[PDB]
Design a protein around this motif. Structure first.
Motif, short mmCIF file in Angstrom:
data_model
loop_
_atom_site.label_atom_id
_atom_site.label_comp_id
_atom_site.label_asym_id
_atom_site.label_seq_id
_atom_site.Cartn_x
_atom_site.Cartn_y
_atom_site.Cartn_z
N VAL A 1 -3.91 -1.96 0.04
CA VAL A 1 -3.21 -1.27 -1.06
C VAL A 1 -2.50 -0.03 -0.47
N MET B 1 -5.03 -5.48 -9.43
CA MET B 1 -4.93 -6.75 -8.69
C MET B 1 -5.69 -7.82 -9.52
N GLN C 1 4.42 -5.91 -11.03
CA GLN C 1 3.61 -5.32 -12.10
C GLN C 1 4.17 -3.93 -12.40
N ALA D 1 4.79 -2.10 -8.95
CA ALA D 1 3.99 -2.62 -7.82
C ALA D 1 4.50 -4.01 -7.50
N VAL E 1 2.77 -7.33 -5.79
CA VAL E 1 1.47 -7.90 -5.40
C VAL E 1 1.74 -9.24 -4.79
N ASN F 1 -0.90 -5.01 -2.23
CA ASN F 1 -0.51 -4.34 -3.47
C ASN F 1 0.25 -3.08 -3.08
N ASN G 1 4.54 -8.10 -16.27
CA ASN G 1 4.50 -8.78 -14.95
C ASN G 1 5.51 -9.93 -14.93
#
Length: 227
Positions: free
Chosen positions: A15, A64, A90, A106, A108, A117, A181
């Motif tokens: 991350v 996540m 996200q 983000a 992912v 992430n 998302n």
């Protein structure tokens, strides 16, 4: 999609967060392992830029849902794995009651065998002496439900929930979360019926760690559609 097969084992996690809250710039990195079979993540996060200028509890939800355990009867509702390995975007707005808001974006996705992430966070309109920039929030576990619904227009999902942060005067700081998302790839994904993710969290400190840091053990379970 066969994204689900990528999660039957233990998956290394990386991350990266770059944050700006009222012009306090900071970075956070994290590592650990996801075992979605058991809905489990074990993680350690560090502030790489010195002292974190906001409380660790305000960053937990950002840092996540692909590691949730979907029971067998609900597997057709797991958007998050269906998007892998190419991944998903996200995006949130988090509104802290009577204080500022975070905007997060983000990505992912898999980089080889690692689930990565990468996050940018912008916070505005915080009170420099309120419960956030003043560091007046309890360092204790955030558990609860994330409500998921299909966004057939964007071919992804929306989510919404309220986090209840304890303040050190006995009051509660409400944080209303709005989540979108969307898949990064153009391959097919699973658009779910309404359900929720239930998170149980244990938070702790590593007594040998000098850096500002947070240790997390998370269990996340899909629910809300009966067997």
């Amino acid at each position: 999609s066969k994204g689900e097969k990528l999660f039957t084992g233990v998956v290394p996690i990386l991350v990266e967060l770059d944050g700006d809250v009222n012009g306090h710039k900071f970075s956070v990195s994290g590592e650990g392992e996801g075992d979605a079979t058991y809905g489990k993540m074990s993680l350690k996060f560090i502030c790489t830029t010195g002292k974190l200028p906001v409380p660790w509890p305000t960053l937990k939800t950002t840092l996540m849902q692909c590691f949730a355990r979907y029971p067998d009867h609900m597997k057709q509702h797991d958007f998050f794995k269906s998007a892998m390995p190419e991944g998903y975007v996200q995006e949130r707005t988090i509104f802290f009651k009577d204080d500022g808001n975070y905007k997060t974006r983000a990505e992912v996705k898999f980089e080889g065998d690692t689930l990565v992430n990468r996050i940018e966070l912008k916070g505005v309109d915080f009170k420099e002496d309120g419960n956030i920039l003043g560091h007046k929030l309890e360092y204790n576990a955030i558990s609860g439900n994330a409500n998921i619904t299909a966004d057939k227009q964007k071919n992804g999902i929306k989510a919404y929930f309220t986090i209840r942060h304890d303040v050190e005067d006995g009051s509660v700081l409400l944080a209303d979360h709005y989540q979108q998302n969307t898949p990064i790839g153009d391959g097919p994904v699973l658009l779910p019926d309404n359900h929720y993710l239930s998170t149980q969290s244990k938070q702790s400190k590593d007594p040998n760690e000098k850096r500002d840091h947070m240790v997390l053990l998370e269990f996340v379970t899909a629910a809300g559609i009966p067997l």
